[PDB]
Structures are given as structure tokens and as C-alpha cells.
Amino acid sequence: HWGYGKHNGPEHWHKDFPIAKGERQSPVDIDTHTAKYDPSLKPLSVSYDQATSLRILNNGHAFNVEFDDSQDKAVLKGGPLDGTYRLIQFHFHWGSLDGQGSEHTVDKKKYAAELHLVHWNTKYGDFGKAVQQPDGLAVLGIFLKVGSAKPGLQKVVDVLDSIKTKGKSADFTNFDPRGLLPESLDYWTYPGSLTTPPLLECVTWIVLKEPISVSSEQVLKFRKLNFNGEGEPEELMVDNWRPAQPLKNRQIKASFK
Ligand SMILES: NS(=O)(=O)c1ccc(-c2ccccc2)cc1
Ligand SMILES: [Zn+2]
Known part of the structure; x- marks a missing residue:
């Protein structure tokens, strides 16, 4: 099964998933001098005031904070998007x-971590149908650098002890994702x-220009998670990232000068 190790990592994925060598793969390097300002891009609309978090899950490759998506409660709109995600x-x-x-x-710079807020296009009815569509998902990507702590991240950090291993989950209600956003919503999109x-190949990527700062202690606690299940040999959940893929026939657009 795929993973991030020497024998099952990103360089192996194409054997089970040939689209790994496709025409619109992510992630990519954002060349800031080649991205073009697009004045027709609208401001992003992040409406998270009514977000309903439910659960946090260690799925063996990351941890997901899951939300109630059975109604329009936390939605992304605007920017390059048509419709409601x-x-x-x-x-x-x-x-x-x-x-x-x-x-x-x-510009080839790697940050300490990257947050992905995953949204699906409501015109497709459910997430499983959405991922089958070229405009099915909108993922908001936010870089993390190590410096000052991010107060709104601490409730996530503090529950990680309870989901150390693959397949463990924990109740995670009343978490407000607005505490994870930077000040500016300037973005690149592709x-x-x-x-x-x-x-x-179903994602409109919206990557924020401004990173958030998290403390060394906060990211340290990420690195104490496990890829393995309970009772299996311990393998720390670290370096669960795919490297940059060829841009091919794509232009990255910027929302800002
Ligand atoms: N890192 S990411 O591009 O934001 C991503 C989100 C959901 C999924 C996913 C996992 C299982 C089934 C369908 C989609 C994969 C990647
Ligand atoms: Zn991701």
C-alpha cells in the first residue's frame, strides 16, 4: 500500500495510480516572478462562522479534522471559483x-508544514461525486513557518496524544478554523x-501568500504521531509530503500585485 517510505513513497505511486504522471498534478513550485496578476480574480470569500467540527482522525498518512458538510455551514466562494464549496x-x-x-x-522555498482546507462543490451533491469532476474540489493551502505559536492551533496540538496511531479518532467539536487563517487572503491559484x-485531477488550488507562524513545540507534537497502527513497530509520522510536480501546460495566477 502507498505511503511515504523508501519503498512505497511518491516515486512509487505511479504504478498503482498512473495519473501520478498526469497533466495537472499537485503540488507544484510557485515561481513568484512567473505567476501573473489577474485583475479579474475576485476576493476570496471564507464563511466559517457556522463551521461544525465533529471528529479528528489519524488515517495513517495525516490527521483530519472533520466537519459536518450535510448543510451549507462552512463554505468557500469567490476567488477563481464559480459556485459554493x-x-x-x-x-x-x-x-x-x-x-x-x-x-x-x-521560488523553491520549502516551509515547515502546509495546511489544506478541503472543500467540495455543492453542485455535485457529495464529496465522492465531486472528486470525479475537474472542478469538484477547492483546497485552500496555507504555509506554516516556525516562530511564534499559533494560539488557534493549540486545541489541535493538545488532542494528538489521543490519536497517536493509525485508525484512532477522537471527538473534536466546537473547533473554529478561523483561528488558523493569516491576516491577508492574497493568493495564487492554479x-x-x-x-x-x-x-x-479535481482540485482548484488556492494557496495563500502569507504563512502562519507556529511554534517549534507545536510542530514537535505533530512529529510524535505514528504512521503505524497500535501494537505495530513505531514509525513516526513525519515527511508526509509529496514533492513538487511538473507544471506542464498550466499558468499560476496571482490575486495581488
Ligand atoms: N492533500 S489533498 O490534496 O488536500 C487531498 C484531499 C483529499 C484526498 C482523498 C483521500 C481519499 C479519498 C478521496 C480523496 C486526497 C488528498
Ligand atoms: Zn493535503
């Missing part, structure tokens, strides 16, 4: 060292894919 979950990718961990890079198998 519902928040279903967020998760992170991170490194074994502060110098790596993000999936997207900015058409891409899920960054884990099945690597479906």
Missing part, C-alpha cells in the same frame, strides 16, 4: 525538520490534483 476536513503535511514539510514551494492517492 463546502468544508469537509482539514489536515496538514509536515517535515522531520523545520526546513522541509510543505508540498507547494515558493488547476491541480489531490496530492495523495488517488491523485485525482
